[PDB]
Amino acid sequence: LAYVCEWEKWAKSTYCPSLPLACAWSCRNLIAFTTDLRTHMIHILDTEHPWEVHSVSSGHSEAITCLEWDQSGSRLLSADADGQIKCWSMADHLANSWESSVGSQVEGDPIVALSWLHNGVKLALHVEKSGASSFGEKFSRVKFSPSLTLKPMEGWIAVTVSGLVTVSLLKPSGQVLTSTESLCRLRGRVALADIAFTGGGNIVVAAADGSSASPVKFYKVCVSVVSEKCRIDTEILPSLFMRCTTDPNRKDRFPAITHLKFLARDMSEQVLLATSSLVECWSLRKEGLPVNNIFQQQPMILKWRILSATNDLDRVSAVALTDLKVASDTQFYPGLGLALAFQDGSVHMVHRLSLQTMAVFYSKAMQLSWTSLALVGIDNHGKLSMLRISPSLGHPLEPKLALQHLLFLLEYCMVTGYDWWDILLHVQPGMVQSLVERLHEEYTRQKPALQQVLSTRILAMKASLCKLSRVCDYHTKLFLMAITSTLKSLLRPHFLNTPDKSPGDRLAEICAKITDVDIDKVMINLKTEEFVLDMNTLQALQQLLQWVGDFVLYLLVSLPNQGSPLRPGHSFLRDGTSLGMLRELMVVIRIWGLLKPSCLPVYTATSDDSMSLLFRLLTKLWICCRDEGAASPASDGLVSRLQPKQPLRLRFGRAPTLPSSTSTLQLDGLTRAPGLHLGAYPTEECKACTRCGCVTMLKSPNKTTAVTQWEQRWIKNCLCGGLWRRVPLSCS
Amino acid sequence: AVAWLVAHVRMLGLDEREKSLQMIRQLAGPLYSENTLQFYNERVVIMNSILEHMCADVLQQTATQIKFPSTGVDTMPYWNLLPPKRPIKEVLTDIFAKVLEKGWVDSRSIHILDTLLHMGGVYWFCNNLIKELLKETRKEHTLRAVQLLYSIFCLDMQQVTLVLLGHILPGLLTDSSKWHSLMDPPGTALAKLAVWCALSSYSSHKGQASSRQKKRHREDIEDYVSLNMRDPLNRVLANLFLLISSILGSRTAGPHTQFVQWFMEECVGCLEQDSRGSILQFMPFTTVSELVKVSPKVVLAITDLSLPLGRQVAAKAIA
Amino acid sequence: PHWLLGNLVSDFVDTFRPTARINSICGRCSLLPVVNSWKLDPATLRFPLKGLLPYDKDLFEPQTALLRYVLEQPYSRDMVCNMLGLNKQHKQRCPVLEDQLVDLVVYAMERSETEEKFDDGGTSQLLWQHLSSQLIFFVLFQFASFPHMVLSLHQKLAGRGLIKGRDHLMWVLLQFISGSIQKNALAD
Amino acid sequence: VADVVFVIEGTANLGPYFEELRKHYLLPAIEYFNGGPPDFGGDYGGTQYSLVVFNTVDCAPESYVQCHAPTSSAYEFVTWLDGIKFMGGGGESCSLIAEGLSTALQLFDDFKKMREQQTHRVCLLICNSPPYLLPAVESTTYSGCTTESLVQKIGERGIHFSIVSPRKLPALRLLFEKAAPPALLEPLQQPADVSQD
Secondary structure (H helix, E strand, C coil), X not given: CECECCCCCCCCCCCCCCCCCCCCCCCCCCECCCCCCCCCCEEEECCCCCCCCEEECCCCCCCCCCCCCCCCCCCCCCCCCCCCCCCCCCCCCCCCCCCCCCCCCCCCCCCCCCCCCCCCEECCHHHHCCCCCCCCCCCEECCCCCCCECCECCCCCCCCCCCCCCCCCCCCCCCCCCCCCCCHHHCCCCCCCEECCCCCCCEEECCCCCCCCCCCCCCEECCCCCCCCCCCCCECCCCCCCXXXXXXXXXXXXXXXXXXXXXXXXXXCCEECXXXXXXXXXXXXXXXXXXXXXXXXXXXXXXXXXXXECCCCCCCCCCCCCCCCCCCCCCCCCCCCCCCCCCCCCCCCCXXXXXXXXXXXXXXXXXXXXXXXXXXXXXXXCCCCCCECCCCCCCCCCXXXXXXXXXXXHHHHHHHCCCCCCCCCCCCHHHHHHHHHHHHHHHHHCCCCCHHHHHHHHHHHHHHHHHCCCCHHHHHHHHXXXXXXXXXXXXXXXXXXXXXXXXXXXXXXXXXXXXXXXXXXXXXXXXXXXXXXXXXXXXXXXXXXXXXHHHHHHHHHHCCCXXXXXXCCCCCCCCCHHHHHHHHHHHHHHHHHHHCCCCCCCCCCCCCCHHHHHHHHHHHHHHHHCCCCCCCCCHHHHHCCCCCCCCCCCCCCCCCCCCCCCCCCECCCCCCCCCCCCCCCCCCCCCCCCEECCCCCCCCCCCCCCCHHXXXXXXXXXXXXXXXXXXXXCCC | CHHHHHHHCCCCCCCCHHHHHHHHHCCCCCCCCCCCCCCCHHHHHHHHHHHHHHCCCCHHHHCCCCCCCCCCCCCCCCCCCCCCCCCCCCXXXXXXXXXXXXXXXXXXXXXXXHHHHCCCCHHHHHHHHHHHHCCCCCHHHHHHXXXXXXXXXXXXXXXXXXXXXXXXXXXXXXXXXXXXXXCCCHHHHXXXXXXXXXXXXXXXXXXXXXXXXXCCCCCCCCCCCCCXXXXXXXXXXXXXXXXXXXXXXXXXXXXXXXXXHHHHHHHCCCCCCCCCCCCCCCCHHHXXXXXXXXXXXXXXXXXXCCCCCHHHHHHHHHC | CCCCCCCCCHHHHHCCHHHHHCCCCCCCCCCCCCCCCCCCCCCCCCCCCCCCCCCCHHHCCCCHHHHHHHHCCCCHHHHHHHHCCCCCCCCCCCCCHHHHHHHHHHHHHHHHHCHHHHHHCCCHXXXXXXXXXXXXXXXXXXXXXXXXXXXXXXXXXXXXXXXXXXXXXXXXXXXXXXXXXCCCCCCC | CCCCCEEECCCCCCHHHHHHHHHHHHHHHHHHHCCCCCCCCCCCCXXXXXXXXXXXXXXXXXCCCCCCCCCHHHCHHHHHHHHCCCCCCCXXXXXXXXXXXXXXXXXXXXXXXXXXXXXXXXXXXXXXXXXXXXXXXCCCCCCCCHXXXXXXXXXXXXXXXXXXXXXXXXXXXXXXXXXXXXXXXXXXXXXXXXXXX
């Protein structure tokens, strides 16, 4: 329906018959796109600005299975497992660089990719409804046995699909071998799917051939015994099978997926699978056996029970799936929703246990992207690009409940620190405006104290809400607020001064209690000597700090623009508190320039100290707007004078978006259709220039000698820095 | 009792009541206790023992070994014999090298091979086989190898040949990475292999085995675009021949020109009936015209039934 | 051989295969019973001299069985010296030979692993110790890239042969290092 | 005997400074328990210690602790973690690691299960940025606060604990002396390596 790509030169590869495909990411950057071009390379693509598609050559054949673990970029490269797991961590998130972290499964073919790190978060959404719980009961975490802790470590241990015993030789971040050999029941044959995270620190696996027989090689295995050894268990869990063969009519089902979910108590995805469609579901409800009929008159045993089964019409399954045991009456979001695309055109997305019907709007392998119902188009139609359908959470309309669910999932994404893509699900930003208003209100009132660690993130979140449209004002305003706050905050504790009664930054913070003008007075009024750190500080003022100077300049000219066709115009910046923070920055950079002549002046004229008059006008407007002040006093008329010193042409970092409203968005693989400030930005490109999409637009090596503070401080993900991209320069 | 013990072994083995039950049942308990008017207790007990031996294999494997209630002479030696603490990547260096150095197929080991067949996948089976094949670097050894290999492909002819013709030939011809292998004189054997398996498959073949008929239910359309019937083997052969004709195209031929040359050469054979060559808008005629530039070999192949279609290729072969 | 060339060369080797068979003798099982230009003397994992085209690599693959059998036998020092050695004091080069004793190290664990020496059923350990002593008598090229011995430790992890081998392994390591302690440095 | 613990956290806040501190405070400290860092056998020799350096929640939404340093023979992995610790850590400057030191306490716990047959347990933690946060562990059962962490490190076990920060001094040393057992946070001095910090 919407969000479809295409590949110009490549096609369905009519020469090769076919190849099984797979991909799955529960975190950001969830595109892997196993395919065959016209063995083949593996692709990675982000959710925003998918124009810059990337790929990288593999080193094996048939690329059968891959599934990441955490936000840390990684992949599996199964199917004889050549070039095993690693990170990217080179300059950005657009190059594989598979390191020496390789596990040599000699000439095998497993289909297992699992062993995550920690517990699944608990969500009492229906009960709590996030009224005033303050993330206490609304978002919790159930105690869960960490797999082979020592601090939770983790490895890529899997199960031999081709083989029949086990995987060994684990070397997680220790470069140690630890080689052994185990028997593992001395017999087996499997074509199973893995289900790892169970109650104890064990792994579960069961399937052999299909509906023909009824074998399940349940292997309850234990790995944590002692360092430099392995004792893999061979505990055979109680077997089971697909009761579909009970029909005396026919038995041709032959399942081929039988996948599970991370909750190993309440699902069994057996299904009749050319010329058939019949889902099945069983549980692990422990119960005693009817020991009777032996005469006139350990009960603990496990015998599976049915959950759900019916006749359907479908060919391909995608993925199985909050917590259960909740009367989800008022809940209509995809809570534990299991959907799968239907071959015959439209996609009948419907939750479990009903399967009846939903809205359709008449006249290979997939996985669920996230809570927002936007699937990936890898259905049984050949080498076709991705698709998306309506994420409508339920039949009826409920704006109140809608925004409630939206804020619930937003706060969940905030506390879990994952990516957010509920963009397509929300209506135009007016409702989103009310939502963010209510959100910041609840944040301020019932934080209660997590604010001091949760503020920055949600500000960036705000950006997303203000990203789509007419309301581009809050976007730029929040970007400047965030960058200024961050830079000033990091500049504060960078003083190797001599100790005093209180901290240097803390004592500088109280500068609010000072007169209006003549900063040269207040600076010596508080302290002058203990502010110099070292001679090698002549790299920040003339190069990067100049920004803030120009910044305040850009305020002046933008002050008398209330009559413009934009209520805040470019920005308003009438908060006062942030303004006071900037004024503190001004006085500290003033004493800095007093300590070194390489500061940032007006650069134009009237030097015989423009900075002084600039600062006094800023303090004037501040005190005129600190505690519920007026806006446009008579002083506004005089400060509105344009002194011959203001420069222009500033970055004001921003990015495009995906305005796919309702109908269709068709793009190619390339050639998109329309619709750190340490210098490092000339007219034409001059280096590799590894940039980012949020605001960054910076250089890769930073081309410096001792300014490593900022560079090292921003080597990793920047402010919402998942969009650290790269692109070479043009050539004639 | 044995059958239901085999049914109940699917538990956690924490009770193991049926194990001791079967052990008691297999004992010498009935030593003329009741008025057993049989007079054949000896042979009956021998049959009971041999039947208990043939079944209960999984129970005598998944649990502790029995206390040897056999007291026989020599039980069935044929078994899995798969080294537990060893991967499946052993067939080549343990079987193929020996059988090439030996003079016969080592019938016993064949049983093992059978277990190897319906255990993994035919795809990777034939893949690793042909991979281990190209190492002799001498025509005689490659000849003996493919000779033994045509035989080892028996008991699974239909599906194995289908998977081969579908993947293993495009798996090298389609790309240039695997082209390196095709240049070898083993390539001639590979061509002989291909034509032999194609001939055997196209020929009448029932192939009805228990472990095969019980495991001969899948789904596959092969996505064989057509741009005298609808049979998987025939369709796969048509797609294969179309790809041969395509590879016979110009602008690049280092290793594969010799491959298609050897293919066409070995295809020439008396008493054969393959290469039907549909004559509506297909390549085989232009293919023969081009192969003539590499004399009367194709002049005999293309002559399907002396139809007026064959007049064209005849005139072209006139030269 | 060259790809774009014809099979004209390949078959030319095959028609050349039988005459070279007229120059073969046997499977080269073993010829070294004595303890005294010569038979069974390879230079670098290859004895033959004719530059013709013999049969499969059975005569090209190193005769590991031969050196394995001769080394485990006592008094082999003179035999190995005359068969592959040259200027034992004027040509120290530390050849590939060490890999051989690596197997002799692995085989070592086997002696302790195989039924756990049948729970000390006999005195094969005595012959083992004697052979190890003889090998230590030839400790002049043993630690060519000394970390190679660590490789022998890696294979020692196979089956976790630290049940009873460790004692004799440390013992023979002592027997070796005792004659070379003051010679080399602690770095090795 | 000599059960020490080495902790640093200012990697996110200030990296290069640590490299300077290593030249004067970190490296000489290790020489108090070894004849010189080279490559030796490692076992339960009492004098072993750990090396724990992590980051904050700024740009790590999937990782908090990955420590692994049981014995390390005090030379190899010690020097490795010293020179190859990290270069990341962005966001802002409000708090880097407090929840880390709590996990540090947990480390002492395993000593009770490992150092059986006292040992005058000692510990040292470094952090440039002044830390403060609401969460406690998010990794294990134990939970508390900075106050709970210090009272555990002092009263629950007489582990001598100091913090050799950069030459600057934040508002941290004050509260860290509220323990009735002597905390001995004195070893923050340009003078040479103290005997036992």
